Amino acid sequence: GLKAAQKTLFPLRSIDDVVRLFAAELGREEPDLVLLSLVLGFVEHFLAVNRVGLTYFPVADLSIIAALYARFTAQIRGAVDLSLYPREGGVSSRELVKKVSDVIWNSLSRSYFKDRAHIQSLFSFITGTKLDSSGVAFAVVGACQALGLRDVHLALSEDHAWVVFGPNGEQTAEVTWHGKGNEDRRGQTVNAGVAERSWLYLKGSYMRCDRKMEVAFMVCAINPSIDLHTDSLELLQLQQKLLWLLYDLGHLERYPMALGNLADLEELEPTPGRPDPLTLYHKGIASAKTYYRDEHIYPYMYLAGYHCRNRNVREALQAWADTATVIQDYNYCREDEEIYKEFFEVANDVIPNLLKEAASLLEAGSQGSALQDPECFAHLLRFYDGICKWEEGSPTPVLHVGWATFLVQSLGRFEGQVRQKVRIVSVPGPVLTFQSEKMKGMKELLVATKINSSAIKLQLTAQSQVQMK
Numbered sequence: 001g002l003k004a005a006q007k008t009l010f011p012l013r014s015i016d017d018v019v020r021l022f023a024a025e026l027g028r029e030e031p032d033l034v035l036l037s038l039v040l041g042f043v044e045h046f047l048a049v050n051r052v053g054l055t056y057f058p059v060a061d062l063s064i065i066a067a068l069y070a071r072f073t074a075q076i077r078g079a080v081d082l083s084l085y086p087r088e089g090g091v092s093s094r095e096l097v098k099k100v101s102d103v104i105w106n107s108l109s110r111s112y113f114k115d116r117a118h119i120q121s122l123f124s125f126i127t128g129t130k131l132d133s134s135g136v137a138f139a140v141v142g143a144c145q146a147l148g149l150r151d152v153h154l155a156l157s158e159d160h161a162w163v164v165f166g167p168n169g170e171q172t173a174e175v176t177w178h179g180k181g182n183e184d185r186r187g188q189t190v191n192a193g194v195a196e197r198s199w200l201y202l203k204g205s206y207m208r209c210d211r212k213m214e215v216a217f218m219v220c221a222i223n224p225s226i227d228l229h230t231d232s233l234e235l236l237q238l239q240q241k242l243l244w245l246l247y248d249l250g251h252l253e254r255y256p257m258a259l260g261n262l263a264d265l266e267e268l269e270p271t272p273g274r275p276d277p278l279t280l281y282h283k284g285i286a287s288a289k290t291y292y293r294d295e296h297i298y299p300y301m302y303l304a305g306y307h308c309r310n311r312n313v314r315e316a317l318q319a320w321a322d323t324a325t326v327i328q329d330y331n332y333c334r335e336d337e338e339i340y341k342e343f344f345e346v347a348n349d350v351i352p353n354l355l356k357e358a359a360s361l362l363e364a365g366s367q368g369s370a371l372q373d374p375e376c377f378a379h380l381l382r383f384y385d386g387i388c389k390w391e392e393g394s395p396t397p398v399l400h401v402g403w404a405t406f407l408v409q410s411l412g413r414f415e416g417q418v419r420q421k422v423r424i425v426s427v428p429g430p431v432l433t434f435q436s437e438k439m440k441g442m443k444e445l446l447v448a449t450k451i452n453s454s455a456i457k458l459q460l461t462a463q464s465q466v467q468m469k
């Protein structure tokens, strides 16, 4: 409307007043996405973008929020004439969804830095005519809710967003761009991407949000960063409290990434009486296993990151091996570059740094060292095996000689007497089975006291020949 009942908590004078508003909306039949996004974007603007004059909390007066809300709903209702797009069965048409998408797109500034912070919310859309890629998808869903189109929902993979709609919520439509320089497929289905088994579309095991999950998304989308060195404590607390609210109401049940986000917040500043970060990372993984066929990568990356920051090398390696065990059953496609970057950084920067420190600490006489644990060597091998298996049958390759130099270095961090204790068994303490042909052929090389660097490089890159002189 806004409806009279939506107005009664205003003004919002504190973090807890914002939480109250969210609790009230979440108790309603259809929480108002437009209201909630505007409120979050307003408070984020005045806590992270411009803190001038801040003394405690940027008071959100009804007149201010109602005027932004009226700006949004006038823009959408004025531009989308529903009479041109008749709705059979309380469900929307592809042409209507494309029209809403066009309205949002055409409203945006012609040129801006697309990966700025703080351009995720409808506050950014209205005040700066700027949205990020997923922010466009969210805005389309909000616009559709404003129009009364109850069937249009947000769909999320781990790196992209689109919408579902239509009979049984079975249709898909692209509504935003992905990446940089990829020509957009706005208006089309996601079926080609599902069919090619790319990570971008998760083999169809992507999130189909309900209205509560869309609230969770906008909460995850809060960006407390003020600058490279500085987060808003007020926004961290708000996001954390809102995520707990959502958790308590059941709305994180099917949202792995949100559980990882909450775990990270709890690591930073734990809430008394709440589960530990580790419990929450494991709940994220459980969510992915239960609802998404264990086809998500980030539940395991979140866990690995926590173990890495806490120098639990064994457990970090195990979680990265688990990441690779998920990726192995995908085809590496155009538009999957973000996950390639994640794996590249782990293999070629993070793991080497962790193992270098471990080596120094072993020299200093550490006991229980990951470098003396054959199960840790097995996790490292399983990580590479999943990456190599991922590469098999993909339309673009993954491995190259850059990766091989780091593999050889990482292998060398383990003494031969440790490496010799892993039992590599064939289909048909530690025991490991390799799924990739690359690692099966490398087995022979993985225990020599002196790693044959040149042979390992040849096997990992499948390089046919060596230099002529």
Ligand SMILES: N#Cc1ccc(OCCCN2CCC([C@@](N)(c3ccccc3)C3CCCC3)CC2)cc1
Binding pocket: 134, 156, 157, 158, 159, 160, 161, 217, 220, 221, 298, 301, 302, 303, 304, 305, 308, 342, 346
């Ligand atoms: N080791 C390790 C490691 C740990 C965590 C890690 O990434 C955790 C952050 C994952 N990232 C995924 C995309 C995600 C997001 N960019 C996203 C999520 C789904 C669909 C599109 C975009 C946002 C979610 C709320 C606003 C947009 C932001 C969080 C990477 C490596």
